[PDB]
Amino acid sequence: VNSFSGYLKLTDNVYIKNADIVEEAKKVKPTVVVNAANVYLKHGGGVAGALNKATNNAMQVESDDYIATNGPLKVGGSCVLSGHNLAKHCLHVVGPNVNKGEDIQLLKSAYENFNQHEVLLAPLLSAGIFGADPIHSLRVCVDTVRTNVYLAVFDKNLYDKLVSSFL
Ligand SMILES: C[C@@H](C(=O)O)[C@H](NC(=O)c1ncnc2[nH]ccc12)c1ccccc1
Numbered sequence: 001v002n003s004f005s006g007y008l009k010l011t012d013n014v015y016i017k018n019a020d021i022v023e024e025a026k027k028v029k030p031t032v033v034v035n036a037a038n039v040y041l042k043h044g045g046g047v048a049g050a051l052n053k054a055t056n057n058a059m060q061v062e063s064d065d066y067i068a069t070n071g072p073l074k075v076g077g078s079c080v081l082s083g084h085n086l087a088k089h090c091l092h093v094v095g096p097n098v099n100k101g102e103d104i105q106l107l108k109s110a111y112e113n114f115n116q117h118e119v120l121l122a123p124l125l126s127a128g129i130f131g132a133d134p135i136h137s138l139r140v141c142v143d144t145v146r147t148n149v150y151l152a153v154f155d156k157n158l159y160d161k162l163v164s165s166f167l
Pocket of ligand 1: 019020021023036046047068117123124125126127128129130152154155158
């Protein structure tokens with residue numbers, strides 16, 4: 001049993017809600033919140049900008065030290081950093097950005113990072129401003145993640161479209 005409320009059950013392990021991931025994190029304080037990061041951990045907009053703003057820029061400060069020490073992530077890769085005031089940990093996951101010309105086949109690899117954590121609050125990777133088909137991303141999520149994932153979809157029209165088209 002956990003604290004996530006009002007999520008629609010899609011499969012044995014995947015649940016979905018039309019919600020702002022920042023507000024969900026502030027309410028539940030999950031062990032892991034997933035950020036839709038880029039390889040440089042530059043948290044400018046989207047999920048990343050919103051999470052970072054909610055941490056008063058502490059996420060960015062921590063991320064800059066991470067990159068200075070370790071260099072950029074891989075597309076499809078991840079790192080575990082602090083969740084600051086929002087969660088115990090933040091799993092920064094890099095899905096491919098189609099608007100940058102990156103390979104959508106890497107989306108499965110990106111979702112595989114979720115399997116290292118028993119429960120996660122997460123966004124829909126590579127969708128929205130990352131340019132990929134959101135129906136496809138949800139399919140890859142359900143067909144790749146085996147641990148318990150609570151998906152928070154910001155856009156209301158998108159949420160309705162995803163639910164109504166889900167197989
Ligand atoms: C799909 C899309 C959505 O769920 O609509 C999602 N975006 C957000 O979650 C979002 N965007 C901008 N400002 C925000 N503030 C609070 C949340 C939030 C998203 C997922 C992966 C990559 C980029 C974007």
